[PDB]
């Protein structure tokens, strides 16, 4: 522990705290009640990452062998980290940039990296909401637009790439995205996805026009919608035909998969993404409470709703994957029934699923020549329960195909999509606080303009930057970017926050601050994880990133409706200028911490 020369006379001094809180009734905002603070915090951490990144990661990492690492890493990094953020913001009375600059003026890179990773994550995260709004506008009609193929110029048959693929794939790839065959060629601005973008940003600027006290009632109405629509969706999903078969696929572990490095990196980067750690929004939200506030009750209540939800969503998601894998298996197996009774002319009430293997041997013993030209499809479950459930391929290709087979199918589309919208809007409330607040402590705007001018300003900029995701190649830009700026940037900052509190500030000084606020010292469970355990697990997951960055090939999926063996996946390699993009998106952030440190130490010299 460095003695940190001049730590006092920079922070409040543990008896000024009762005095400074009675004079901040007009400078800094407040919460209305305690329930407005809890619904803002657990609405920032849920949604769009329980549906999009979790089941996409869960199939690859052992089918259902992703729930072990996840849970353990959660309870071992998640808890400790989330608890360290609620307590360092409540005492230091500042945002994200004001906390880490009062714990040595060299660690100002953590406030500038938490601002740059909140701008780049929320750049593409508000594009997924504009795709959700496009699917909500396309409801309110009983023949749903993704339920049938269009016809040719000559009205005789369907379009050639709607006949080979699904009609749900000819609404996402060709009628929504209008996707191209590579990332190296981009088309035009695609005006109908521009309007939606505008819509999204406009709706985001209406609720956060003044920071807190507008985000309040919003959080109210949006922390209920999401929670009650999921429950209405649970008793529908378990009543389906093929359910309780994708649930068993979620819970049969593949224990060989638990000994790979890449299944602990994706589990470790999901905890710092599900919990909104290393963003700086949960420090600014906890900096508005009173000093005598139990910040330990709040950190273990929010964490057991965040852990319970990520399993509660995953058994709703996998109850409709098992329903598509029974609709497809009963249609592939009905193909083998109908192709046998048409080649040998049998009645229909004799060949069924109980004796298909009995009677196909009877057909080659009767006519060995007429049986040779027949074809028999080879299909069985665990081949339909393991498919391409890639990014933006579950809410748009898996759910929207299953909704069109329920009765009252326009009703289950609206509900579902509004639910997704809510889940994704309430997480952009706190993500706007990670950009507005440290840009307001930097003194770059003249401090007589209102708060509603800076906010609007930011919005415009981000909307004008969101034009790169509306091109023809705009889905290939969102994947790459997504993954990279969502994996690297989290881990580094998360580790810098745990180190600088217990080894630069001081964990023994920090225990005097907890005893003043909540009434007692932290337990022995908080002492081992802060000093020994969790700094280490993080320091580890950080070496697993370079083990799997090397010894892998950068590939991405390509649609290409001229490629032979069309509807299966085709993976080609990235161009050589993608390292410049990757570099920027996952460098700027990290090079920022050491960057500023160096800068200041130099100013020293």
């Amino acid at each position: 522990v460095l003695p940190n020369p001049g730590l006092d006379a920079r922070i409040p001094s543990l008896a000024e705290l009762e005095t400074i809180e009675q004079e901040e009734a007009s400078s800094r905002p407040k919460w209305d009640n305690k329930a407005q603070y809890m619904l803002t915090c657990l609405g920032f951490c849920v949604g769009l990452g329980n549906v999009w990144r979790f089941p996409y990661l869960c199939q690859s990492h052992g089918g259902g062998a992703f729930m072990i690492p996840f849970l353990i890493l959660l309870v071992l990094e998640g808890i400790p980290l989330l608890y360290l953020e609620f307590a360092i913001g409540q005492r230091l009375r500042r945002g994200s940039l004001g906390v880490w600059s009062s714990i040595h003026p060299a660690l100002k890179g953590l406030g500038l990296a938490s601002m740059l990773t909140s701008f780049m994550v929320g750049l593409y995260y508000n594009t997924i909401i504009s795709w959700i709004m496009w699917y909500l506008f396309n409801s309110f009609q009983e023949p749903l637009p993704w339920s049938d193929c269009p016809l040719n110029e000559n009205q005789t048959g369907y379009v050639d790439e709607c006949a080979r693929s699904s009609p749900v794939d000819y609404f996402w790839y060709r009628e929504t995205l209008n996707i191209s065959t590579s990332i190296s060629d981009s088309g035009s601005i695609q005006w109908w996805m521009l309007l939606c973008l505008a819509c999204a940003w406009s709706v985001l600027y209406m609720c956060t026009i003044r920071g807190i006290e507008t985000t309040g009632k919003a959080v109210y109405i949006t922390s209920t919608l999401p929670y009650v629509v999921l429950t209405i969706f649970l008793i529908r999903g378990l009543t389906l035909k093929g359910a309780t078969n994708g649930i068993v696929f979620l819970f049969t572990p593949n224990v060989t998969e638990l000994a790979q490095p890449d299944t602990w990196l994706d589990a470790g980067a999901q905890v710092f993404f599900s919990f909104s750690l290393a963003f700086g929004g949960l420090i600014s939200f906890s900096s508005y409470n009173s000093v005598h506030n139990n910040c330990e009750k709040d950190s273990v209540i929010v964490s057991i709703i965040n852990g319970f939800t990520s399993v509660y969503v995953a058994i709703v998601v996998y109850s409709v994957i098992g329903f598509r894998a029974t609709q497809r298996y009963d249609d592939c197996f009905s193909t083998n029934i109908l192709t046998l009774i048409n080649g040998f002319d049998l009645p229909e009430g004799n060949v069924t699923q109980e004796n298909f293997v009995d009677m196909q041997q009877r057909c080659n013993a009767s006519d060995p020549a007429a049986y040779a030209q027949l074809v028999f499809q080879t299909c069985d479950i665990n081949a339909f329960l393991s498919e391409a459930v890639e990014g933006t391929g579950l809410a748009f290709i898996v759910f929207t195909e299953a909704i069109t087979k329920m009765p009252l199918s326009p009703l289950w589309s609206v509900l579902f999509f509004i639910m997704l919208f809510c889940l994704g809007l309430s997480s952009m409330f706190g993500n706007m606080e990670g950009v507005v607040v440290p840009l307001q402590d930097l003194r770059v705007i003249p401090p007589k303009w209102p708060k509603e001018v800076l906010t609007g300003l930011i919005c415009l900029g981000t909307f004008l930057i969101g034009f790169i995701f509306t091109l023809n190649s705009g889905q290939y830009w969102l994947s790459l970017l997504d993954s990279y700026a969502g994996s690297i940037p989290l881990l580094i900052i998360a580790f810098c926050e745990m180190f600088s509190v217990v080894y630069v500030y001081g964990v023994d000084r920090f225990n005097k601050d907890i005893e003043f606020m909540i009434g007692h010292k932290p337990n022995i469970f908080w002492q081992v994880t802060w000093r020994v355990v969790s700094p280490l697990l993080m320091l580890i997951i950080f070496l697993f990133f370079f083990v799997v960055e090397v010894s892998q090939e950068l590939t991405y999926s390509i649609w290409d409706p001229g490629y032979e063996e069309f509807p299966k996946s085709q993976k080609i390699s990235y161009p050589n200028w993608v390292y410049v993009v990757v570099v920027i998106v996952a460098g700027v952030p990290s090079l920022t911490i050491p960057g500023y440190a160096i800068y200041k130490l130099i100013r020293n010299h």
């Binding site: 496009w134 909500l136 506008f137 396309n138 309110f140 009609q141 309007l195 939606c196 505008a198 819509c199 406009s202 709706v203 600027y205 209406m206 026009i209 003044r210 507008t214 209102p450 509603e452």
Partner: protein, 31 residues
């Protein structure tokens, strides 16, 4: 004969753009 998605967009973008000119004039007529 119009694309039902443009009507629902026109109602939703209409109730947003008038909701910002209430929340801007309230702020002013409030400070």
């Amino acid at each position: 004969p119009v694309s039902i998605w443009l009507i629902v967009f026109g109602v939703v973008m209409g109730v947003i753009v008038v909701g910002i000119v209430i929340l801007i004039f309230t702020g002013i007529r409030d400070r």
